[PDB]
């Protein structure tokens, strides 16, 4: 009458999926890393109306433990998609239906206690309809955790049953830096709360406030902030091939002085202005001034040889951080700009090709993880951008069709967090897709550690087995987990 099973972090559990074969879980992680798993529940006969869920400490040798304080629990909320995202090529969405995505937190981060009052509450819950309920479990490994094996439990209980499963965790003898190696720019347009920034930083994502009106050292020390934008927006975009004269060298220096002097600074100058060759000399004029002031120029455009020199005589490109879609990738031009000292980042939106990972709810969950980590590393890319995180509809917990344009509908476009009000909290809550992006950032970190230990070629051979390019990446979470384990076991070996 009470069927319980586990699923890996990037395995989608549908409401109608059959019970799996294991109720235990075996995980592996470094210090300073998250690993996650899911507990799925089904009532194949009747109803349990009052279901609770708890976890224990993870016990290691003797007295040794990882506290349950390091585990974060949520109940998955399913949202109904009535209109598919675009269907093209071989990378297709899974069809209209119920999708798990919003995460109902057991604990309000502001109180460290359960919410009350919410329209939706994590626990207790009812198990109905033969229809699955799913608990998401995050484990954060403490930076001081001794390497070795730890075991704890989860307990599912109701008025008519109780089932207990094992959580096995092996902690490897290495640590992910607090400051992530992968840089990012995720934009926030409407939610000005400190809690919204904080929710992103906790998932290893760097964010910038967009569209601010005229009216951090802590976040660095706590969350390892690794870059910051200065916010001189030229206003030039895909529809506006026009640019004003640049801020002056000392104007750029003045904005920069509001940040710590050790923090990597960029400027998001212009957006998708690639077709406007009109703008090359103005771009070079902006670049020369940023360069004199020690600031990187970031534009969402593909490398063009005309901009590989800023006209200052130094040889330096006019764009320092080239931000491209998967479909724009050109091996020869990317190798040229990497070789001369630039960065290339990836970004994603809509459904613009037949083959690339796509960022909508109705695609395979793996697509949010595979881009920042394995594919970026295989192609030498060092960052990720996303245009918006808070693009909510009027009914954000029930309607995720966030963009309708040109006969197409997009489910989750520009939307990675949900407002807290519906669950009785102030401030936003994560989605399952945000957890995948976090995991990809940690995947990127594994490869970076191996490069730094002098094992770049082997690391990239492993990276090419699951994420070699934008066309031939794995759709199988089991194979991705395998690849990651190979990396972690090698690092562990090298550090012992
Ligand atoms: Mg349609």
DSSP character string of 243-276: --PPPPHHHHHHHHTTS-TTS-EEEEEEES-TT-
Give the other-Cβ count within 10 Å of 339's Cβ. 9
* DSSP code for 59: E
Q: Which residues pair with 229 in a beta bridge?
A: 266
Distances (CA, A) of 333 to 239, 340, 344, 372: 26, 11, 11, 20
How much distance in Å is there from the Cα of 86 to the middle of ligand 1? 7
Ion ligand 1, residue ranges at CB < 5 A = 83, 409
Expressed in angstroms and rounded, the spacing between residue 410 Cα and the centre of ligand 1 is 9
**Sole residue written with tokens 């796509």:** 358
Integer angstrom CA distances of residue 132 from 4, 43, 120: 10, 8, 17
Segments of 176-252 assigned E as strands? 183-188, 207-209, 228-229
- In the reported structure, the alpha carbon of residue 358 is separated from the centroid of ligand 1 by a whole-number distance in angstroms of 17
Expressed in angstroms and rounded, the spacing between residue 83 Cα and the centre of ligand 1 is 5
Kindly give the distance from the C-alpha atom of residue 409 to the centroid of ligand 1, in angstroms, as a whole number.
Answer: 6
Domain locations in the chain as residue ranges: 3-173, 183-495
Q: How many angstroms is it from 111 CA to the middle of ligand 1?
A: 42
- What single DSSP character describes residue 240? B
Q: Distance from the CA of 432 to the center of ligand 1, in angstroms?
A: 24
CA distances in angstroms from 178 to 97, 133, 182, 225, 386, listed in the order given: 38, 33, 11, 9, 22
* Residue 176 and residue 442 in contact, taking contact as beta carbons nearer than 8 Å: yes
Q: What is the DSSP letter of 274?
A: T
At how many Å resolution was this determined? 1.8
Distance from residue 370's CA to the centre of ligand 1 (Å):
26
Q: Which of 294, 319, 326 is nearest to 305 (CA)?
A: 319
Dist CA 250 CA 253 (whole Å): 5
320 in Cβ contact with 298 (< 8 Å): yes
How far, in Å, is the centroid of ligand 1 from the Cα of 292? 49
Number of CB atoms found within 10 A of residue 64's CB: 12
Q: Any residues with CB less than 8 A from the CB of 480 and at least 6 apart, and which?
A: 10, 366, 369, 370, 374, 466, 467, 474
Query: CA 186, 35, 324 angle in degrees (round to 5)?
Result: 30
| Cα–Cα distance, 151 to 169 (Å, whole number) | 6
Residues sharing a CB contact under 8 Å with residue 461, sequence separation 6 or more, in sequence order: none
**Cα-to-centroid distance, 363 and ligand 1 (Å):** 15
Non-local (6+) Cβ contacts of 129 within 8 A are none
CA-wise closest residue to 102 among 199, 1, 237, 4? 199
Q: Which run of H or of E encompasses 321?
A: strand 321-324
Distance 430 CA to ligand 1 centre (A): 27
> 75 has which bridge partners?
104, 135
Strands 162-175 and 25-31: parallel
- Dig out the tokens for 325 from the structure: 């879609």
Q: What is the spatial distance between Cα 121 and Cα 265, in angstroms, rounded to a whole number?
A: 41
367 labeled binding residue:
no
Half-sphere exposure of 325 (CA within 13 A, CB side): 16
Say how far residue 197 (Cα) sits from the centre of its chain: 14
CA of 164 to the centre of ligand 1 (A): 44
63 vs 66: CA distance, rounded Å? 10
Residue 19 structure tokens = 């019970």
Cis preceding-peptide flag for 482 (omega within 30 of 0): no
Give distance in angstroms: CA of 362 to centre of ligand 1: 13
Do the domains 183-495 and 3-173 match in fold? no
**Architecture of the domain whose range is 3-173:** Sandwich (2.60)
Alpha helices in 262-344 (DSSP H): 280-292, 331-340
* Experimental method, per PDB record: X-ray
CATH of 183-495, one of 3.40.50, 3.20.20, 1.10.287, 1.10.1060: 3.20.20
Mutual orientation of helices 456-466 and 477-495 as an angle, nearest 10°? 170
């Amino acid at each position: 009458s009470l069927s319980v099973w586990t699923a890996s972090s990037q395995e989608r559990v549908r409401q109608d999926d059959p019970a799996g074969e294991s109720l235990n879980i075996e995980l592996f992680a470094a210090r300073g890393e998250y690993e996650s798993f899911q507990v799925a529940l089904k009532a194949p006969e009747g109803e349990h109306r009052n279901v609770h869920f708890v976890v224990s400490d993870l016990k290691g040798t003797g007295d040794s433990f990882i506290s349950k304080s390091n585990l974060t629990l949520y109940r998955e909320h399913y949202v109904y998609i009535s209109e598919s995202s675009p269907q093209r090529g071989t990378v297709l969405p899974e069809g209209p239906g119920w999708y798990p995505d919003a995460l109902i937190p057991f604990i309000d981060p502001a109180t460290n206690e359960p919410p009350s009052g919410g329209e939706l509450i994590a626990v207790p819950f009812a198990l109905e309809n033969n229809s699955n309920q799913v608990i998401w479990v995050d484990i954060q490994v403490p930076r001081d955790a001794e390497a070795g094996h730890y075991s704890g439990s989860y307990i599912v209980s109701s008025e008519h049953g109780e089932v207990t499963g094992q959580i096995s965790l092996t902690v490897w003898n290495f640590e992910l830096p607090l400051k992530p190696s992968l840089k990012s720019t995720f934009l926030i347009w409407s939610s000005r709360k400190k809690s919204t920034v904080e929710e992103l930083l906790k998932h290893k994502l760097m964010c910038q406030q967009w569209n601010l009106s005229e009216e951090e050292g802590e976040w660095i020390e706590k969350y390892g902030v690794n870059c910051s934008g200065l916010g001189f927006w030229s206003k030039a975009d895909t529809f506006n091939g026009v640019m004003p004269p640049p801020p002056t060298v000392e104007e750029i220096q003045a904005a920069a002085s509001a940040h710590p002097s050790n923090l990597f600074l960029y400027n998001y100058t212009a957006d998708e202005i690639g077709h406007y060759t009109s703008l090359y000399e103005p771009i070079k004029a902006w670049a020369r001034n940023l360069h004199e002031a020690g600031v990187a120029n970031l534009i969402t455009m593909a490398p063009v040889p005309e901009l590989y020199d800023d006209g200052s005589g130094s040889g330096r490109s006019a764009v320092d951080i080239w931000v491209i879609l998967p479909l724009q990738y050109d091996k020869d031009r990317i190798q040229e700009v990497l070789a001369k000292g630039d960065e290339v980042w990836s970004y994603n939106c809509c459904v613009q090709d037949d083959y690339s990972p796509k960022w909508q709810i109705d695609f395979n969950p793996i697509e949010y993880r595979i881009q920042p980590g394995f594919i970026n590393q295989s192609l030498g890319m060092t960052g990720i951008l996303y245009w918006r995180v808070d693009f909510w509809t009027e009914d954000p917990w029930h309607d995720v069709l966030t963009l309708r344009a040109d006969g197409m509908e997009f489910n989750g476009e520009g939307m990675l967090v949900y407002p807290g009000e519906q669950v009785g909290i102030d401030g936003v809550v994560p989605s399952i897709r945000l957890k995948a992006i976090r995991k990809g950032i940690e995947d990127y970190e594994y490869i970076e550690i191996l490069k730094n230990l002098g094992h770049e070629q082997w690391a990239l051979e492993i990276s090419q087995s699951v994420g070699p390019d934008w066309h031939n990446w794995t759709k199988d979470h089991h194979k991705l987990e395998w690849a990651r384990k190979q990396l972690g076991e090698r690092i562990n070996d090298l550090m012992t």
